[PDB]
Amino acid sequence: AKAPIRARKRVRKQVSDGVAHIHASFNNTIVTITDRQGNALGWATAGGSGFRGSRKSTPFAAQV
RNA sequence: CUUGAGUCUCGUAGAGGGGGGUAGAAUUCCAGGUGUAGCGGUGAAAUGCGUAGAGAUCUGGAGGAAUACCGGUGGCGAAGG
């Protein structure tokens, strides 16, 4: 019967507020979330979000 | 003789020259924390770097060159500068 709702296993750390850094360049854009005291909390990128080619340096790819 | 040319005091502007020190931003490298799979590159790509933990990100150190903006048809210089 059962068909699932929860998106992941239960939350970890839990910090309420953070800093993000967007390193935007002519070939690729990297978005990296951190804590105020300097800790990566996760990242994703245009190239890792499955664009490649010329699409890798586009505002639409940056969004995704 | 004194208009030429030289000379004296008072001042002014400027990256003019030489010798010493010093400060910040940044690329780099080493060190350590976080953190996950690409990163880097182009017309597109591959070689490269990456699952031995890179890229990004926070801290600290090392070093060496240059010295943003101001800077402008600007200015100084015998010219190169």
Curated annotation (Swiss-Prot):
Q: Tell me the domain of life.
A: Bacteria
Modification N-methylalanine occurs at:
A1
Signal peptide residues are none
* Additional note from the record: Has been predicted to contact the N-terminal domain of IF-3 based on footprint studies; exactly how IF-3 interacts with the 30S subunit is controversial.
Tell me, what does this protein do in biology?
A: Located on the platform of the 30S subunit, it bridges several disparate RNA helices of the 16S rRNA. Forms part of the Shine-Dalgarno cleft in the 70S ribosome.
Q: How does it assemble?
A: Part of the 30S ribosomal subunit. Interacts with proteins uS7 and bS18. Cross-links to IF-3. In stalled ribosomes contacts ribosome rescue factor SmrB.
Family, per entry: Belongs to the universal ribosomal protein uS11 family.
Q: What is the protein name given in its UniProt record?
A: Small ribosomal subunit protein uS11
Which gene is transcribed and translated to give this protein?
rpsK
Q: Which residues of the full protein are shown?
A: 2 to 65 of 129
